[PDB]
Structure formats: C-alpha cells, structure tokens
PDB file of C-alpha atoms in Angstrom:
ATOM      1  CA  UNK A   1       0.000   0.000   0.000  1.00 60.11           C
ATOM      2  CA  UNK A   2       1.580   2.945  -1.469  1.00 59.96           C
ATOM      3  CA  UNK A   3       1.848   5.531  -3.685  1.00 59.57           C
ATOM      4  CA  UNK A   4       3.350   4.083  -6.357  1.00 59.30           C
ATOM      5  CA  UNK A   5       2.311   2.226  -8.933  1.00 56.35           C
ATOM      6  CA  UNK A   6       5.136   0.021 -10.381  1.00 55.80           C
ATOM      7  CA  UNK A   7       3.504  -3.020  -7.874  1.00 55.74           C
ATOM      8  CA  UNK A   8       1.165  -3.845  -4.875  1.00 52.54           C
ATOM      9  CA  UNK A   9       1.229  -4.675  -1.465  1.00 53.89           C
ATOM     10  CA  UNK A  10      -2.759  -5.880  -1.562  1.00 56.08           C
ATOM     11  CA  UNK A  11      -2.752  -4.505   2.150  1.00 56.65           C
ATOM     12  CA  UNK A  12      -5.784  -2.714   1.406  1.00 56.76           C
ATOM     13  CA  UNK A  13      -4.684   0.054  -0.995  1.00 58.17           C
ATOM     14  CA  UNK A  14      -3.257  -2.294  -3.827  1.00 57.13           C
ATOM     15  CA  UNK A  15       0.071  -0.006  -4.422  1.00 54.37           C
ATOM     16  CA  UNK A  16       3.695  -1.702  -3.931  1.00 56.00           C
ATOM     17  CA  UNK A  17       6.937  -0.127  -5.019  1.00 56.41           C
ATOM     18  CA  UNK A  18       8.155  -3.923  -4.620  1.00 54.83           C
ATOM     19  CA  UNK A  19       6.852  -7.452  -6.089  1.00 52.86           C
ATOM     20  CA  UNK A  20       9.734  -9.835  -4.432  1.00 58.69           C
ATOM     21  CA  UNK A  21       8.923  -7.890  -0.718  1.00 60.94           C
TER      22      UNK A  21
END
C-alpha cells in the first residue's frame, strides 16, 4: 500500500513499489 504504482502490497490500498517484498 503505497503511492506508487510500479507493484502492490494488496494490504488494502493495492500499491507496492516492490513485487519480491
């Protein structure tokens, strides 16, 4: 959950700067 959009973190907002974290 962040403001990027390169990934998610699917903790809610669906934004990861990571896919391997």
């Amino acid at each position: 959950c962040l403001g990027v959009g390169s990934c998610v973190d699917f903790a809610g907002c669906g934004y990861a700067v990571v896919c391997f974290x």
